[PDB]
C-alpha cells in the first residue's frame, strides 16, 4: 500500500548546473530497529538498464560520482546532482524497501545546450528494395538542437505529406544534440513517374530550410 | 565480476504462458533476495515479486498486479533464477530484468540485468528486409523494414565502428516496424574500406551483414 511519486516529470538543465528532485512516499520509510529509510535512488541511461546510485536514502555506492547526493527522511526524499555532466542525461527511479518494493514513476533529466543545426543526408530506395515493389526514400537529420524540427517532403516539387514516418533518437549522452530520420514509402510504379525527391529540414538555427534532393534520372 | 543475464523473452499470444530466466555469477547466490521488475516500453519499472535467501527459506512474495498468475523460482545449484508468467495481457508486453536484492544487511538493488523483451500479440513474427543506404564526413545507413516483434539490433563493423552512429527507434505501422540506423566516417576511409550493417532479428533467428556499395 506504499505511493511513490516523484518530481517534476521531466526538466532539463545545462551542463554544469545543479539538478534537484524530489521523492515522496504515502508512508514514512524509515525502519525503527535500524534507524534507516529505506529508500533508494537509480539511474537509467537511454537503452541501458536501472544503476543503483545511493541508498538508505544517502548512501552513495562505491563507483558513483561525488556530484550525486541523495537526502531527506521519512516521507521525503531528494537527489541533488551538482555540475551535472552531459553524461547525466537519464531517467532518475526512487525505490521504497520497507513494504516489499515499490518504484515511483520516474524524472527524465534532459540537458540542455547551445542551439545546433541538423546534418542532412538523403538516400534513394536500393535496388533490393525496388526489385520488390517497394521504393523508401530516407533522409536523416543529425546532431541537432533543440529537438523541435519540421520535415518536409517534396516530390518534383509539391509537398507530400502521406507515406512518411518520423523517429527520433534519445538525446546524446555526450553532445546533448538529438537525431531524427524521416522515411518516405511509395510504391515502385508510383517513384518511376516523378524524378526529383526532397527532403526539407527547417529549423530554429536558420530562417533557411535545410535542402537534400536527388534526381532519379542520375541514379 | 557480478553477472546477471535473462533469456526467455519473445512474442506470445494472449492467454498463453512464458517462462524466463536469469542466470547469475559473481557472487553467492543463496546469500541474497532476487527480484524481478519489468517496463513496457517507455513507461516506469514496476517491481513484481522476490524470492528470499536461504537464511528466509526461499519464500516468495509478489505485488498485487501479479500474484496468484505470475511465480518464481530459483535454482541454487546453477544460480539461475527463474519467473513463471501465466494467462499474459497486452499490459504484460515489457522488458523483464531480474535484480540482485536483499542480503540480510543493505537495503539496494546492486546488480540488474540486461533485460529481456517480451511481446503479448495475435500477430506473427515477420523478419525484417534490410537495405543499403548509399549516397569530408560520409554518413550510409541501414533501413531495417517490417519485421515484428521488437527487437533488432544493429552493429556496424561488427560493433568496431560505435562512435557516430544513431540508431533510430523503431515505430510500428500495420502492425510491422521499421528502424533505420545511419552511421558517419571519413570520406577518405570509405567505400576505401568496407561498411557493413549487422543486423539481428532474434523472433526469427535472423542474422544480416549489409556491406554499403557506392555507386
Ligand atoms: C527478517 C527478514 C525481513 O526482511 C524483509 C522481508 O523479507 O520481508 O523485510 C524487511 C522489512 O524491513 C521488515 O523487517 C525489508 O523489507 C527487507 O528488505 C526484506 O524484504
Ligand atoms: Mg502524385
Ligand atoms: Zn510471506
Known amino acids: 500500500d506504499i505511493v511513490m511519486s516523484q518530481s517534476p516529470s521531466s526538466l532539463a538543465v545545462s551542463a554544469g548546473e545543479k539538478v534537484t528532485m524530489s521523492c515522496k512516499s504515502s508512508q514514512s520509510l524509515l525502519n525503527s530497529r535500524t534507524r534507516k529509510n529505506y529508500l533508494a535512488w537509480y539511474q537509467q541511461k537511454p537503452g541501458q538498464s536501472p544503476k543503483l546510485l545511493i541508498y538508505?536514502?544517502?548512501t552513495r555506492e562505491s563507483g558513483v560520482p561525488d556530484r550525486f547526493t541523495g537526502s531527506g527522511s521519512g516521507t521525503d526524499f531528494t537527489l541533488t546532482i551538482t555540475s551535472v555532466q552531459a553524461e547525466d542525461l537519464a531517467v532518475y527511479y526512487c525505490?521504497?524497501?520497507?513494504?516489499?518494493?515499490?518504484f515511483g514513476g520516474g524524472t527524465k533529466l534532459e540537458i540542455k545546450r547551445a542551439d545546433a543545426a541538423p546534418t542532412v543526408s538523403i538516400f534513394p530506395p536500393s535496388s533490393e528494395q525496388l526489385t520488390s515493389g517497394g521504393a523508401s526514400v530516407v533522409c536523416f537529420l543529425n546532431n541537432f538542437y533543440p529537438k523541435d524540427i519540421n520535415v518536409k517532403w517534396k516530390i518534383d516539387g509539391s509537398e507530400r505529406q502521406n507515406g512518411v514516418l518520423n523517429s527520433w533518437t534519445d538525446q546524446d549522452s555526450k553532445d546533448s544534440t538529438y537525431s531524427m530520420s524521416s522515411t518516405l514509402t511509395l510504391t515502385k510504379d508510383e517513384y518511376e513517374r516523378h524524378n526529383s525527391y526532397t527532403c526539407e529540414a527547417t529549423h530554429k538555427t536558420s530562417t533557411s530550410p535545410i535542402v537534400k534532393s536527388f534526381n532519379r534520372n542520375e541514379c | 565480476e557480478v553477472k546477471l543475464v535473462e533469456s526467455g523473452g519473445g512474442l506470445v499470444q494472449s492467454g498463453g504462458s512464458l517462462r524466463l530466466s536469469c542466470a547469475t555469477s559473481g557472487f553467492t547466490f543463496t546469500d541474497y533476495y532476487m527480484s524481478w521488475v519489468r517496463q513496457p516500453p517507455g513507461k516506469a519499472l514496476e517491481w513484481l515479486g522476490f524470492?528470499?535467501?536461504?537464511?528466509?527459506?526461499?519464500?516468495?512474495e509478489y505485488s498485487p498486479s501479479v500474484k496468484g498468475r505470475f511465480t518464481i523460482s530459483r535454482d541454487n545449484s546453477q544460480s539461475i533464477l527463474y519467473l513463471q508468467m501465466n494467462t499474459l495481457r497486452a499490459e504484460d508486453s515489457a522488458t523483464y530484468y531480474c535484480?540482485?536484492?536483499?542480503?540480510?544487511?543493505?537495503?539496494?538493488?546492486?546488480?540488474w540485468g540486461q533485460g529481456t523483451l517480451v511481446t503479448v500479440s495475435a500477430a506473427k513474427t515477420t523478419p525484417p528486409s534490410v537495405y543499403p543506404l548509399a549516397p569530408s564526413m560520409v554518413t550510409l545507413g541501414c533501413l531495417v523494414k517490417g519485421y515484428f516483434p521488437e527487437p533488432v539490433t544493429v552493429t556496424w563493423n561488427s560493433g568496431s565502428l560505435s562512435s557516430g552512429v544513431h540508431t533510430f527507434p523503431a515505430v510500428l505501422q500495420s502492425d510491422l516496424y521499421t528502424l533505420s540506423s545511419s552511421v558517419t566516417v571519413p570520406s577518405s576511409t570509405w567505400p576505401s574500406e568496407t561498411v557493413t550493417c549487422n543486423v539481428a532479428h532474434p523472433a526469427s533467428s535472423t542474422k544480416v551483414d549489409k556491406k554499403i556499395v557506392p555507386r
Open positions: 524470492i528470499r535467501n536461504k537464511a528466509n527459506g526461499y519464500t516468495t
Open positions: 538508505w536514502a544517502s
Open positions: 525505490k521504497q524497501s520497507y513494504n516489499l518494493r515499490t
Open positions: 535484480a540482485r536484492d536483499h542480503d540480510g544487511y543493505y537495503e539496494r538493488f546492486s546488480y
